[PDB]
Design an enzyme around this catalytic site. Structure first.
Site, PDB file in Angstrom:
ATOM      1  N   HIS B  41       0.800  -1.213   0.000  1.00 34.33           N
ATOM      2  CA  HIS B  41       0.000   0.000   0.000  1.00 34.33           C
ATOM      3  C   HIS B  41       0.833   1.263   0.000  1.00 34.33           C
ATOM      4  O   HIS B  41       0.254   2.358   0.032  1.00 34.33           O
ATOM      5  CB  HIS B  41      -1.020  -0.017   1.153  1.00 34.33           C
ATOM      6  N   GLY B 143       3.015   5.674   9.434  1.00 35.11           N
ATOM      7  CA  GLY B 143       4.348   5.545   8.943  1.00 35.11           C
ATOM      8  C   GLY B 143       5.096   4.327   9.425  1.00 35.11           C
ATOM      9  O   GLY B 143       6.237   4.129   9.018  1.00 35.11           O
ATOM     10  N   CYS B 145       4.232   1.124   8.997  1.00 39.26           N
ATOM     11  CA  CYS B 145       4.088  -0.079   8.198  1.00 39.26           C
ATOM     12  C   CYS B 145       5.425  -0.450   7.565  1.00 39.26           C
ATOM     13  O   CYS B 145       6.275   0.392   7.277  1.00 39.26           O
ATOM     14  CB  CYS B 145       2.989   0.103   7.148  1.00 39.26           C
TER      15      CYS B 145
HETATM   16  C1  LIG Z   1       1.053   1.881   8.087  1.00 39.55           C
HETATM   17  N1  LIG Z   1       1.992   2.703   8.069  1.00 39.55           N
HETATM   18  C2  LIG Z   1      -0.291   2.176   8.793  1.00 39.55           C
HETATM   19  C3  LIG Z   1      -0.255   1.764  10.252  1.00 39.55           C
HETATM   20  C4  LIG Z   1      -1.615   2.127  11.040  1.00 39.55           C
HETATM   21  C5  LIG Z   1      -1.657   3.434  11.050  1.00 39.55           C
HETATM   22  C6  LIG Z   1      -2.039   3.872  12.632  1.00 39.55           C
HETATM   23  N2  LIG Z   1      -1.584   2.914  13.407  1.00 39.55           N
HETATM   24  C7  LIG Z   1      -1.268   1.663  12.498  1.00 39.55           C
HETATM   25  O1  LIG Z   1      -0.806   0.630  12.848  1.00 39.55           O
HETATM   26  N3  LIG Z   1      -1.333   1.378   8.219  1.00 39.55           N
HETATM   27  C8  LIG Z   1      -2.547   2.022   7.675  1.00 39.55           C
HETATM   28  O2  LIG Z   1      -2.731   3.201   7.764  1.00 39.55           O
HETATM   29  C9  LIG Z   1      -3.533   1.048   7.082  1.00 39.55           C
HETATM   30  C10 LIG Z   1      -3.592   1.039   5.478  1.00 39.55           C
HETATM   31  C11 LIG Z   1      -4.986   1.522   5.075  1.00 39.55           C
HETATM   32  C12 LIG Z   1      -5.582   2.077   6.217  1.00 39.55           C
HETATM   33  N4  LIG Z   1      -4.779   1.395   7.449  1.00 39.55           N
HETATM   34  C13 LIG Z   1      -5.263   1.192   8.807  1.00 39.55           C
HETATM   35  O3  LIG Z   1      -4.545   0.671   9.593  1.00 39.55           O
HETATM   36  C14 LIG Z   1      -6.703   1.608   9.086  1.00 39.55           C
HETATM   37  N5  LIG Z   1      -7.325   0.497   9.689  1.00 39.55           N
HETATM   38  C15 LIG Z   1      -8.407  -0.226   9.035  1.00 39.55           C
HETATM   39  O4  LIG Z   1      -8.802   0.108   7.969  1.00 39.55           O
HETATM   40  C16 LIG Z   1      -9.028  -1.411   9.800  1.00 39.55           C
HETATM   41  F1  LIG Z   1      -9.882  -0.936  10.752  1.00 39.55           F
HETATM   42  F2  LIG Z   1      -9.665  -2.170   8.855  1.00 39.55           F
HETATM   43  F3  LIG Z   1      -8.052  -2.134  10.455  1.00 39.55           F
HETATM   44  C17 LIG Z   1      -6.775   2.854   9.987  1.00 39.55           C
HETATM   45  C18 LIG Z   1      -8.284   3.129  10.299  1.00 39.55           C
HETATM   46  C19 LIG Z   1      -6.084   4.013   9.224  1.00 39.55           C
HETATM   47  C20 LIG Z   1      -6.054   2.618  11.332  1.00 39.55           C
HETATM   48  C21 LIG Z   1      -4.477   0.155   4.593  1.00 39.55           C
HETATM   49  C22 LIG Z   1      -3.977  -0.073   3.184  1.00 39.55           C
HETATM   50  C23 LIG Z   1      -5.133  -1.000   5.414  1.00 39.55           C
END
Ligand SMILES: *C(=N)[C@H](C[C@@H]1CCNC1=O)NC(=O)[C@@H]1[C@@H]2[C@H](CN1C(=O)[C@@H](NC(=O)C(F)(F)F)C(C)(C)C)C2(C)C
Ligand SMILES: *C(=N)[C@H](C[C@@H]1CCNC1=O)NC(=O)[C@@H]1[C@@H]2[C@H](CN1C(=O)[C@@H](NC(=O)C(F)(F)F)C(C)(C)C)C2(C)C
Lengths: 306, 306
Positions: B41, B143, B145
């Site tokens: 992503h 950030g 991930c």
């Molecule tokens: C990667 N850098 C981030 C890590 C998230 C961000 C906040 N704390 C974490 O661990 N990953 C994301 O932002 C991913 C990404 C889209 C949105 N996302 C989420 O983690 C979202 N969660 C969900 O959609 C759910 F609920 F299904 F788990 C969010 C609401 C932003 C926390 C993709 C491609 C999954």
């Protein structure tokens, strides 16, 4: 989101760990430039630990009596001296992995990571606090002495602890990197006991702020308190006094959340008086006091190290 | 003595972290030999996250669209492909710091260390467990991930987790290093929820053994139980079933202490039914389930990593 007892990355310190053997005894040393720092009791035999005369035992050692190894590689010792409770072994090779570093003497209440080591090799890393009674609640076994505690700020490793001994109750004592003990302890197998410990109030407040930041808000009440009245309650429950400096240091978290420090103090007052009634805060059933304000901000803002 | 939530030394993994930027988005990658692994992503814009067609978005990217940096140093991307939910970016330079390594898919109940990173730089290290519902209770921000989870066995780093997303309740989900999610999750911003979690019974027993080894013995009773009768109680309190394999895996700690696994089961049964009545075990007011039997033995025997 989430909040964990997080340690510093240990790679810079791993590159500095060596094995130091003098006769029978092997413990760990810290290799920075061309000096290896280790606990002086490496020169003792299991015979006399109840009260060694270290200065005397050392006059009868020469450079070659010290076997220093960095991994497989022997480092030739070309000089030796004692500074308080540590030995400085000058070696013929400077550590090419020496990070930027300082030696610091931390204050009670501050936190650091320990890299626990055996035979010069790392076993694991965990975060600790210097307790008000100048002990740390660590995890250490025979052979772990010379393991060090450190902080990192950007590229700079501040070494603040070297491990020397274990006190009754299973708590731990050691020195700064100039070989001076934290607390009223010495490196002799005699009857020593930690003083009564106390809870680090400013750190508990920092962790409550961490909980609010993470959405765990059930313990916030509607009240405030004065600093003086709060400290009367703190005292009864064996909490250290909160000073104005502490309040000022909590300013960033107070600003971020909009909760005045003294409002948070009123909420902590109620937790001390009434307990948690089976609820948890940030997953914990007890109030946590081993996160400083800086630790909370670091973790909740993603501070990294170069 | 002492018992801490201990993480693996992180140095081998630190040498592998890089920054991956595609247009706006920057996250972390893992650089092993001449391949960088990162979450797919990274190729998305804040515009469409609710349901990206990753395969489609990737056909319109070329090698030069990926800015890969290891510290200050740009690594030229010379190929790219997608494998499930991760991107493999072939680069023109093999990482000279590549450790001996494997990719493993861990089982629920097993533990690993996370090296939390931002912009390719480490923030900290902490130990986690893969929960029965295939989440981890981590600490992650925007950030993070591409941060990875790992075990070390002697000289070999087993990479088992890469971080992708955060679920409601503030728990975390991710993939193995072949890009397959743990659990029924996907990398799309849609309504996803963890299943109900359960307590890892074999790990709780391992920690009770750790407590006995450390001298914290107040909870041992005089009784035994059968495996079947114990599991009826476990079920009621949302503990996972204890299997004979679990019993066999606990053998080393049972042998060390002389406490049969089923005797320890009788003691845990009583703790579940009666609570702890304000007492602690190894400093904790709750039963801890994120230490495996191997973790306990490693920590209590001083196992190190070459
Ligand atoms: C990667 N850098 C981030 C890590 C998230 C961000 C906040 N704390 C974490 O661990 N990953 C994301 O932002 C991913 C990404 C889209 C949105 N996302 C989420 O983690 C979202 N969660 C969900 O959609 C759910 F609920 F299904 F788990 C969010 C609401 C932003 C926390 C993709 C491609 C999954
Ligand atoms: C260094 N490798 C060990 C680390 C100890 C060992 C077990 N867990 C630890 O942290 N340090 C020692 O063995 C030091 C050493 C003599 C004896 N010692 C102790 O830690 C002893 N403690 C005390 O004497 C007391 F109670 F005063 F703290 C022991 C009873 C062996 C735990 C010297 C030179 C202090």
């Amino acid at each position: 989101s989430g909040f964990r007892k997080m340690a510093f990355p240990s790679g810079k310190v791993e590159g500095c760990m060596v094995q130091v053997t003098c006769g029978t005894t092997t413990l760990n040393g810290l290799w920075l430039d061309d000096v290896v720092y280790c606990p002086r009791h490496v020169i003792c035999t299991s015979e006399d630990m109840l009260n060694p005369n270290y200065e005397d035992l050392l006059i009868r050692k020469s450079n070659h009596n010290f076997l220093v190894q960095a991994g497989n590689v022997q480092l030739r010792v070309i000089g030796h001296s004692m500074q308080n409770c540590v030995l400085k072994l000058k070696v013929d090779t400077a550590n090419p992995k020496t990070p930027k570093y300082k030696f610091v003497r931390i204050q009670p209440g501050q936190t650091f990571s320990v890299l626990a080591c055996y035979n010069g090799s790392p076993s694991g890393v965990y975060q600790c606090a210097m307790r008000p009674n100048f002990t740390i609640k660590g995890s250490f076994l025979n052979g772990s002495c010379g393991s060090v505690g450190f902080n990192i700020d950007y590229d700079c490793v501040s070494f603040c602890y070297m491990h020397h001994m274990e006190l009754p109750t299973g708590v731990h004592a050691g020195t700064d990197l100039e070989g001076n003990f934290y607390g009223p302890f010495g490196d002799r197998q005699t009857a020593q006991a930690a003083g009564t410990d106390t809870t680090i109030t400013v750190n508990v407040l920092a962790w409550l702020y961490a909980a609010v930041i993470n959405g765990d808000r059930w313990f916030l009440n509607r009240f405030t308190t004065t600093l003086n009245d709060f400290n009367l309650v703190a005292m009864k429950y064996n909490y250290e006094p909160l000073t104005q400096d502490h309040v000022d240091i909590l300013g960033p978290l107070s600003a971020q959340t909009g909760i005045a420090v003294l409002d948070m103090c009123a909420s902590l007052k109620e937790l001390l008086q009434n307990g948690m009634n089976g609820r948890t805060i940030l997953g914990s059933a007890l109030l946590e006091d081993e996160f400083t304000p800086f630790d909370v901000v670091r973790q909740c803002s993603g501070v990294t190290f170069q």
